[PDB]
């Protein structure tokens, strides 16, 4: 905690006195002795997260369901549509057919 | 320094962030306007006028 | 330890770091507690518009600012407190709006430096200023009128 | 909203117009005052 002196409003530091540690100013002889406990906590942020990911329920946050993939022709699907091509006027598809863990990845 | 801190802000995090600057200023013996101006002039480039 | 020479915490409103063991107000409730709650007097400071709705009487003028020094003593206006917290100040044919200014927390004292002699003067401590009021012309009413 | 209460009359005074100065301490809170501090000198120019 930042403390200031009533004499000149400058910063107060801790310094060992002849009988007890005290707050003192580097410009004026104003001092203030310490009687009881004086604390100043900060309460930093605690890492409350667990960092779990990869669940099939959270993974299936996709639109395409019950389509026909060109690999195994099964309902399940996971499509990605991209439009970031100017040389190629049509769009771009990326299908991920995975129910029995096939791992289909093509264009 | 109290007036400077009041001008900056009264939030606890603001004082916690501004503390290192006050500490670095208190490292030197600069407490008056004349000493600060002397330091600045020492840090001023030579304009070659 | 001296009870008046303690340290100064950054928060001026909560300088009581060690003990022996504020919500924002409004002008209407301010005047209510100043008069109805108690009869004790209080020194206040208010900001007024640069130009007042009046002509400087024989003050050698150009539509300049009609300062308070140009006016004379006596009643010059009425402070009105309406329902729902509406507070106004009638200064003739117009009514200005009075609100609370910046809530000062440091020491603001009102004193008079009376220079009774060329080399001798009496400084009288009138009191301490706690609140700050601001008066502004009601441009909306003036535009709705004409 | 009728101005039912507190019709305060606003008077003007010119007795201390040129002799009134507003002093304020930005570093001293309003809680502590300089009443007990013995004033020694006050050098001011008109
Ligand atoms: Zn000090
Ligand atoms: Zn399929």
**Which residue has tokens 């004033």?**
D39
Write the secondary structure of A42-88 as one string of H (helix), E (strand) and C (coil): CCCCCCCCCCCCCCHHHHCCCCCCCCCCCCCCCCCCCEEEECCCCCC
Q: CA-to-CA distance for C35 and B29, rounded, in angstroms?
A: 53
Q: CA-to-CA distance for A4 and C7, rounded, in angstroms?
A: 7
Q: How far is the CA of A10 from the centre of ligand 1 (A)?
A: 5
Cβ distance of B26 and A11 shorter than 8 Å: yes
Q: Which long-range contacts (CB under 8 A, 24 or more apart) does D17-22 make?
A: D17/C69, D19/C112, D19/C113, D19/C114, D19/C115, D20/C110, D20/C111, D20/C112, D20/C113, D21/C111, D21/C112, D21/C113, D22/C45, D22/C108, D22/C110, D22/C129
Q: CA-to-CA distance for C116 and C90, rounded, in angstroms?
A: 36
Evaluate the CA torsion angle B20, B21, B23, B27 in order and state its sign.
positive
Contact C83, D1 (CB under 8 A): yes
Q: How far is the CA of A61 from the centre of ligand 1 (A)?
A: 62
Q: How far is the CA of A72 from the centre of ligand 2 (A)?
A: 5
Q: Look at residues D17, D3, B45 and name the one whose alpha carbon lies nearest to residue C83.
A: D3
Residue A8 neighbours by CB distance under 10 Å = 15
Residue D40 neighbours by CB distance under 10 Å = 5
Residue C59 neighbours by CB distance under 10 Å = 12
Q: Look at residues A31, C45, A33 and name the one whose alpha carbon lies nearest to residue D30.
A: C45
Give the 3-state secondary structure of residue C5.
Answer: coil
Q: How far is CA A41 from CA A38, A44, C12, C50, D3, in A?
A: 10, 9, 20, 49, 52
Angle subtended at Cα C107 by Cα C104 and Cα C113, rounded to the nearest 5 degrees? 115
Half-sphere exposure of A11 (CA within 13 A, CB side): 21
Q: N- to C-terminal Cα distance for chain C?
A: 66
Q: Look at residues B2, D18, A15, A76 and name the one whose alpha carbon lies nearest to residue C114.
A: D18
Resolution value in angstroms = 4.1
Instruction: Phi first, then psi: give them for residue B35, nearest 5 degrees.
Output: -65, -40
**Which residue has tokens 């000493």?**
B35
Q: CA-to-CA distance for A14 and B26, rounded, in angstroms?
A: 13
Contact C101, C141 (CB under 8 A): no
Q: CA-to-CA distance for C46 and C69, rounded, in angstroms?
A: 15
Cβ distance of D32 and A6 shorter than 8 Å: yes
Feature table: binding site of A for Zn(2+): 5, 8, 25, 28, 69, 72, 98, 102
Q: CA-to-CA distance for C104 and C69, rounded, in angstroms?
A: 26
Instruction: Phi first, then psi: give them for residue C123, nearest 5 degrees.
Output: -90, 115
Angle subtended at Cα D15 by Cα C137 and Cα C118, rounded to the nearest 5 degrees? 125
**DSSP assignment letter at A36:** S
Experimental method: cryo-EM
Distance from CA of D8 to the nearest CA of C (A): 5
Contact C46, C132 (CB under 8 A): yes
- Between the CA atoms of D27, D33, D37 and D39, what dihedral angle is there, to the nearest 10 degrees? 80
> Which listed CATH number (3.40.250.10, 2.20.25.10, 1.10.540.10, 3.30.470.20) goes with A56-106?
2.20.25.10
How is the beta sheet containing C122-129 ordered, strand by strand?
C122-129, C106-114, D20-29
Q: How far is CA A49 from CA A43, A56, A58, A59, in A?
A: 17, 20, 17, 19
Instruction: Quote the tokens at residue A25.
Output: 């100013």
């Amino acid at each position: 905690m930042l403390l200031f002196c009533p004499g000149c409003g400058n910063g107060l530091i801790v310094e060992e006195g002849q009988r007890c540690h005290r707050f003192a100013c580097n410009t004026c002889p104003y001092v203030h002795n310490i009687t009881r406990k004086v604390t100043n906590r900060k309460y930093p942020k605690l890492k409350e997260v667990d960092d779990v990911l990869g669940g099939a329920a959270a993974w299936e946050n996709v639109d395409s369901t019950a389509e026909s993939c060109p690999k195994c022709e099964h309902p399940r699907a996971y499509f990605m549509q991209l439009q970031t091509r100017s040389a190629d006027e049509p769009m771009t598809t990326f299908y991920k057919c995975c129910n029995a863990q096939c791992g289909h990845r093509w264009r | 320094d109290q007036e400077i801190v009041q001008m900056i802000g009264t939030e606890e995090h603001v004082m916690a962030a501004f503390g290192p600057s006050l500490e670095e200023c208190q490292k030197a013996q600069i407490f008056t306007q004349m000493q600060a101006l002397k330091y600045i002039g020492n840090k001023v480039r030579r304009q070659r006028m | 330890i001296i009870n008046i020479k303690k340290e100064k915490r950054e928060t001026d409103e909560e300088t009581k770091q060690i003990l022996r063991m504020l919500p924002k107000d409004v002008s209407v409730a301010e005047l209510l507690r100043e008069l109805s709650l108690t009869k004790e007097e209080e020194l206040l400071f208010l900001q007024l518009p640069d130009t007042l709705p009046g002509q400087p009487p024989t003050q050698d003028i150009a539509e300049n600012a009609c300062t308070l020094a140009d006016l004379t003593e006596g009643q010059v206006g009425k402070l009105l407190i309406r329902k729902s917290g509406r507070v106004q100040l009638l200064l003739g044919k117009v009514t200005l709006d009075v609100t609370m200014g910046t809530a000062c927390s440091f020491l603001q004292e009102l004193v008079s430096v009376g220079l009774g002699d060329s080399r001798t003067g009496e400084m009288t401590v009138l009191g301490h200023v706690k609140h700050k009021l601001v008066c502004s012309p009601d441009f909306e009413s003036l535009l709705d009128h004409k | 909203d009728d101005p039912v209460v507190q019709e305060i009359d606003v008077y003007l005074a010119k007795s201390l117009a040129e002799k009134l100065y507003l002093f304020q301490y930005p570093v001293r809170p309003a809680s502590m005052t300089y009443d007990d501090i013995p004033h020694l000198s006050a050098k001011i120019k008109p």
